[PDB]
Amino acid sequence: STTNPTLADVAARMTPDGKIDPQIVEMLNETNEILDDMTVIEANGFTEHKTTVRSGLPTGTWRKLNYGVQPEKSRTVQVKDSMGMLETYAEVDKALADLNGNSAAWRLSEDRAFIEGMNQTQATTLFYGDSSIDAEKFMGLTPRFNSLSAENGQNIIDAGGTGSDNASIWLTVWGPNTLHTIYPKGSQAGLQSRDLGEDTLIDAAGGRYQGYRTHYKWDIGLTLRDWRYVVRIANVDVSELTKNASAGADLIDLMTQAVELIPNVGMGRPAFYMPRKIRSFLRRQITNKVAASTLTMEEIAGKKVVAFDGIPCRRTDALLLTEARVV
Template sequence: MATIGTQNLTLLDLQKRMDPNGNVAQIIEQLDQSTEIIQDMTMVECNQGSSFVTTVRTGLPDVTWRKLYGGVQASKSSTRQITDNCGMLEAYSQTDKALVDKSKDKASFRATEDKAFVESMGQELCRTIFYGDENTPEKFIGLAPRFNTLDIKKAASAENILDAGGTGNLASIWLVGWGPLSVHGIYPEGSAAGLHQEDKGVVTVTKDDGSMFEAYRTHFKHDVGLTVRDWRNVVRIANIDVTKLTNDAKAGADLINLMIEAEERIPNLGGVRPVWYMNRTLRTFLRLQKNTKHGSTITEDMEMGKLVTRANGVPVRKIDALLSTESRVIA
C-alpha cells in the first residue's frame, strides 16, 4: 500500500501551513536550491518549430599576400549545422477539494503547494542545463556532454576545458558567456518563453480501484532547450577534487588562478554576458582563498538585499544542482 501523504497533501500538511490564528503561515522552503541560472539565461525563439538550427563556422578561408601582377586563389570558409531541440517539462499539482475548503484562504493555501512544484521544476531545469544528455532523449542536451573531453582531436571544445588535476570527488566550475550569438536558451516557435501555470479548477479524480474524489488541479509546463552557438564562450574548469581544497590554495586546486586562466579562453568577455557557476563547496573555498591571495580579484557586494560574489566583476552564482561526484574528464 502506498504511504499516505507522499504524493498528496494531508490534514497534517494543512496544519503545518497554518499559524495559530488559522491563517496560512509563511513556508520556509528548507529544500530550496539555487536556480539563479534560469534568471541569467538569454532566451531565443526557435527558428524551426521546437528546434533551433545553428550554422557553426568550423574553418576560416585562406588569405594571401598578393604581389604586383600576381594572382590570388579563391577560398571559402567551412560550416556545419547543429540542431538543438526543446524538452517538455511538466507537472500537475492535485489537492483534495475538501482539504482546501478547510482553509480560510483557499487561494493562498493552494499557492503554498504550487510554489513547491515551481521550485522542483526549477531544480530539474538546472540539472538538465548542466547534465542533460542524449541518453535521455526527452531532455535537451546540457553543457557537460558538450564539454567532456580533453582531446582536441575529438572535439574543438576541448580547448576550453581546464584540467584541475583531481581524480576523485570531482566538481566543475563553469564560465558561461550568455548571448543570442554565443550561448542561449530556446523555446518553441510561436509560444511565450518561461514557465506556464494554469489553474484547472475542480476536477473529478478516479483512483485505480474506481473510487472518485474532487480535487483542485494546477498544470505546470515549461518547454525549453539550450544551444551553444559558439563553444568559445563556455569554459569548464573540470576535475576539481573538493576534498583537497584548502583556504590558502597551497594544496589542491587554486580556484582563483584557474578562473583567471578561464577568462582568457573567452575571445571577448565584453561582447557577452558572462556568469560563473559553481556549487556551494567551491564557492565557499573561493571566498576563503580570496582572503589569503588575490584579494582584489574576488569582491562581494549587496544587490537587492542579496550578497553577490564577483570575480573580476563577473557574478559568481551558487548552483546546488552542480555535483561533487562528477566523472573525471579525460582525453
C-alpha cells in the same frame, strides 16, 4: 494496498491554530541561480535551433601581374540542438482546498513549493542534463565539454585533479549569439503555471469525486552557439583544496585563466557558477593571496565574493560536488 498521491488530509500538517501557515520555513529549497541569469530566445527550427557555424575561411593568394588566381569558397557546417519538456499537474480534491477557507492560501503554498522543485530540476539538468542518457531531457553544459579530445577541449581547463571526488567551475557568457536557452515555437518560456480550474475528476470506483488541478509546464533546451564563450574548470579535487592556495588546485589562477580563455567578453554577459563549497574556498583563498600583500585588520574575513573579474559569481546549489573525473 498503498494509496497515493493527491494532496489529502495532511493540509492539517500545513496549518497553526487557524489558516494555512504563511511562515512555513522552506527547508529543502536551494537557491542556485542560473535561472535568473540565462537569456531565452525562441528556438527557430521545428524542435531544434539549427545554427550555421563557420568551418573554413577563403585563404586568398598573391598574384603576379597578368595571371588570374583561383576563386575561394567559404565552407560552413551547421549544428542543431533540441529541447525537453518539464511539467507536472498538481491536483487537490476541491473539498480539501476549500475547508477552513484556505483555497487560495493552500493553492498558493503548494504553488510556491512547486516553483521551487521546478527550479531545482531545471537547474540541475541545465548542468548535467544528458540527452543521450535521459533520452527525454535537453543536453546541458556537460558533457558538451567533456573529453579533452573534443575540438573545444581547449575550453575546458583541467584543474589537474583525479579521483572520483571532484567539482567543476563554469564560466559562460549568456547572450543571444553565444549561449542561451530556447523554448519551442510557440510554447512560451519559461515555466508556465497555468491554473486548469476546478474540474470534475473520476473516483477509481467511478463517482464524481470532483476537484482542482494546476499545470506547470516548462519546456527548455539549451543552445551553445559557440563553445568559445564557455569554459569548464573540470576535475577540481575538493578534498585537496586548502585555504592557503597550497595543496591541490589554486582557484584564483584557475579562474583568471578561465577569464583569459574567452574571446572578448563583449556580449551579452558572462557568469561564474560554482558549488557553494568552491565559493567558500575561493573566498578563503582570495583573502589568503592578498594576505601576502595588503589586507587590513577589518577585511581579515574578506568581502564575500561577488564579481570576480568583475564577472558575477553566482552560487549554484543545483550543481553536483562529487562528479567523476573528466579526462
